[PDB]
Design a protein around this ligand. Structure first.
Ligand SMILES: Nc1ccccc1C(=O)OP(=O)(O)OC[C@H]1O[C@@H](n2cnc3c(N)ncnc32)[C@H](O)[C@@H]1O
Length: 394
């Protein structure tokens, strides 16, 4: 296989550079604007990080976060995005687990300490559209025409996602493009220019796909918001941004019921993940003319791998495996279940599957045994081949 770089690959995708990619605080950035800034920032990060160095980003959703993440990948660093409001010990544990060289935090955040503590840098106060994260002062201004991408095997780790003792899921160029194609192209068929709004943030793998990657991958644009998603703020964003595609979770759709008319003004594709979408929620929204598509993803599988298809969703159901994925149910003795209406543990293989955990015991890595990911979820299949969640194994 040819050595490649995920950021470089995204930049080569054939979409109009003048179209929007990210929206933030009433402002918009084009593909070209972000690419220029990412390359400039990469030229600075290359003075600080060697290929392979890990980076933890403890930041609220913003274009600067998304661009910094891709600039890290551009230089061969391995970033991970975590909750900016993580307790100090939790951030320390993650930074220690991936042996991070650098942590980028919110303004006024404390410095990391302890054995092999990473360098801590801070975002600027005032929430600028584009932030240098003190790099101008630390390593000097950026180069003007940087393009020194670090190219590596497409199966090698290029970023981490942390969902007990923290476990970092490795994601590679190959399986990232894999989960993007299966979900953004094959399931949702996102179109260039589509305005996307994910309420879940980029420290959740669901939100990272929705907001960080799919805009680049499909030529769409995403609203990024660094404040918490109170129903009041979600409503403000809906009215201001008018997204065509909404990524939520079941409780969010419940909370949006009083604002159904405003949501229906612009939302044509409504997705729900994270936990099962109740029939009552599906049917409330159907009565207002909105189909909600329930699908399951997991960090170890990159994104959604089994879902209701737009135009064909059904209540009280998780739908069908996405193109490229294979799903299997096993009984308590490990035997494959062929019958309908019989629950078992769901295993999955396919394009989005992670190559493994960054640092783990053999027992932890055994969740990936045999080229499948063992979800730990109990599911049953009906005669049509559709799946329904039934709980967690024990
Ligand atoms: N990482 C993701 C990317 C995309 C979309 C979701 C995720 C995501 O949730 O990733 P996590 O690793 O935090 O959690 C995975 C676990 O969450 C549960 N689950 C998720 N979606 C559903 C659903 N629709 N119905 C029923 N259970 C669901 C299930 O227990 C699963 O094992």
């Amino acid at each position: 296989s040819t050595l490649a770089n995920l950021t470089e690959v995204l930049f080569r995708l054939d979409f109009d550079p003048d179209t929007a990619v990210y929206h933030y605080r009433g402002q918009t950035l084009s593909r070209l604007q972000c690419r220029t800034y990412i390359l400039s920032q990469a030229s600075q990060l290359a003075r600080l990080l060697k290929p392979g160095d890990r980076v933890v980003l403890a930041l609220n959703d913003s274009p600067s976060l998304a661009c910094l993440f891709l600039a890290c990948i551009a230089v061969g660093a391995i970033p991970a995005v975590i909750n900016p409001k993580s307790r100090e010990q939790a951030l320390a544990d993650i930074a220690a687990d991936c042996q991070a060289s650098l942590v980028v935090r919110e303004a006024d955040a404390p410095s990391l300490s302890g054995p092999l503590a990473p360098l801590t840098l801070r975002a600027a106060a005032g929430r600028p559209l584009l932030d240098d994260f003190s790099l101008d002062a630390l390593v000097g201004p950026a180069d003007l025409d940087w393009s020194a991408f670090h190219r590596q095997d497409p199966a090698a780790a290029c970023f981490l996602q942390y969902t007990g003792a923290p476990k970092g899921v490795m994601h590679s160029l190959r399986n990232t493009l894999g989960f993007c194609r299966a979900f953004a192209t094959e399931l949702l068929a996102l179109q260039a220019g589509d305005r996307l709004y994910s309420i879940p943030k980029m420290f959740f793998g669901y939100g990272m796909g929705n907001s960080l990657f799919f805009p680049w991958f499909s030529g769409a644009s995403a609203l990024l918001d660094d404040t918490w998603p109170s129903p009041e703020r979600v409503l403000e964003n809906l009215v201001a941004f008018r997204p065509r595609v909404l990524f939520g979770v079941p409780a969010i759709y419940a909370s949006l019921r009083p604002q159904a008319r405003e949501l229906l003004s612009s939302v044509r594709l409504a997705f729900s993940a994270g936990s099962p979408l109740p029939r009552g929620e599906f049917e409330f929204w159907a009565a207002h003319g909105l189909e909600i598509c329930d699908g399951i993803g997991a960090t170890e599988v990159g994104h959604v791998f089994l879902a209701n298809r737009p135009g064909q969703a059904r209540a009280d159901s998780t739908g069908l495996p996405l193109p490229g994925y294979e799903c299997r149910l096993v009984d308590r003795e490990g035997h494959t279940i062929e019958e309908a209406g019989r629950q078992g543990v769901l295993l999955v293989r396919g394009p989005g599957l992670s190559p493994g955990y960054w640092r783990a015991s053999e027992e932890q890595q055994a969740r990936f045994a045999g080229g499948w990911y063992r979800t730990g979820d109990l599911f049953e299949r009906d005669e049509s081949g559709a799946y329904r969640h039934c709980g967690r194994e024990d």
